[PDB]
């Protein structure tokens, strides 16, 4: 099966509104500097 | 007050002092024209022409003798290979009114 008519720039963009990526949940290292991902390790300091 | 002068092919309700537009009068640009057909006269003390309120007249200074914006007149018949395109600009006379029934 093939598309029977080309998608318009408008249709194709409407189809894409949900296709983002969410900004990662993140938190400041207490007194270390570089921030890290939530409930994840604080690294080597 | 009101006019209801019959100035083009059409009736026109003029109020005196308001510039109006009408199909061209071919009278020179500065000159004063008078409208000799007045069908009605409003405000206080109305006269109702049947037709033309008799002797009543509207006076108007001529303002301009222009032609309106071009309108292309395009047209076609599908699957028949025919079309016509004609430009058109309809000539007019703009003029301010002054003194109704005068």
């Amino acid at each position: 099966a093939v598309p029977k008519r080309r998608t318009s720039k408008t249709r194709k963009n409407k189809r894409r509104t949900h296709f983002k990526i969410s900004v990662p949940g993140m938190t400041e290292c207490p007194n270390c500097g570089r921030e890290y991902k939530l409930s994840h390790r604080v690294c080597k300091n | 007050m009101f006019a209801i002068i019959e100035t083009g092919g059409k009736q026109i309700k003029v109020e005196e002092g308001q510039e109006i537009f009408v199909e061209k009068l071919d009278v020179n640009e500065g000159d004063t024209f008078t409208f000799d057909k007045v069908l009605f006269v409003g405000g206080d003390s109305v006269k109702v022409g049947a037709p033309t309120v008799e002797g009543a007249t509207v006076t108007a200074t001529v303002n301009k003798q222009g032609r309106g914006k071009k309108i292309t007149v395009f047209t076609y018949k599908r699957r028949k290979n025919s079309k016509r395109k004609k430009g058109h600009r309809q000539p007019y006379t703009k003029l301010t009114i002054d003194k109704i029934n005068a």
């Binding site: 318009s8 | 209801i4 109305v46 037709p51 395009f74």
Partner: protein, 116 residues
């Protein structure tokens, strides 16, 4: 002498595109599509200019019908009586009168009931 393409086609086409302005997406962009929408546009406007003359006459007439009903008289009889009295006023006029001067329209009406 060979003659090359050059300018001409592009200016013809660009003319056509600029002609197509409020148009939806590809209708304002591609020459083929836009040429078609402009052609049809011309035809539509040509007929519409003619019909518009009617579409206003009817609106006037309904306003007259209303103003007449208000004085307990149908538009049919109002126009017949205005004819018989020889009033020869316009419909656009008769209605703008009914809007901007009730006393006057009432007077014309009374003129119309007379000679009926």
């Amino acid at each position: 002498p060979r003659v090359k393409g050059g300018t001409v086609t592009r200016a013809r086409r660009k003319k056509t595109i600029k002609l197509a302005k409020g148009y939806f997406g590809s209708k304002h962009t591609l020459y083929k599509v836009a040429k078609q929408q402009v052609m049809k546009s011309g035809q539509y406007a040509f007929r519409d200019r003619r019909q518009r003359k009617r579409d206003f006459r009817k609106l006037w007439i309904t306003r007259i019908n209303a103003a007449a009903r208000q004085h307990e008289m149908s538009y049919s009889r109002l126009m017949n009586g205005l004819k018989k009295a020889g009033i020869d006023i316009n419909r656009k006029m008769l209605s703008e009168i009914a809007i901007s001067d009730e006393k006057a329209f009432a007077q014309l009406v009374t003129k119309a009931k007379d000679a009926l």
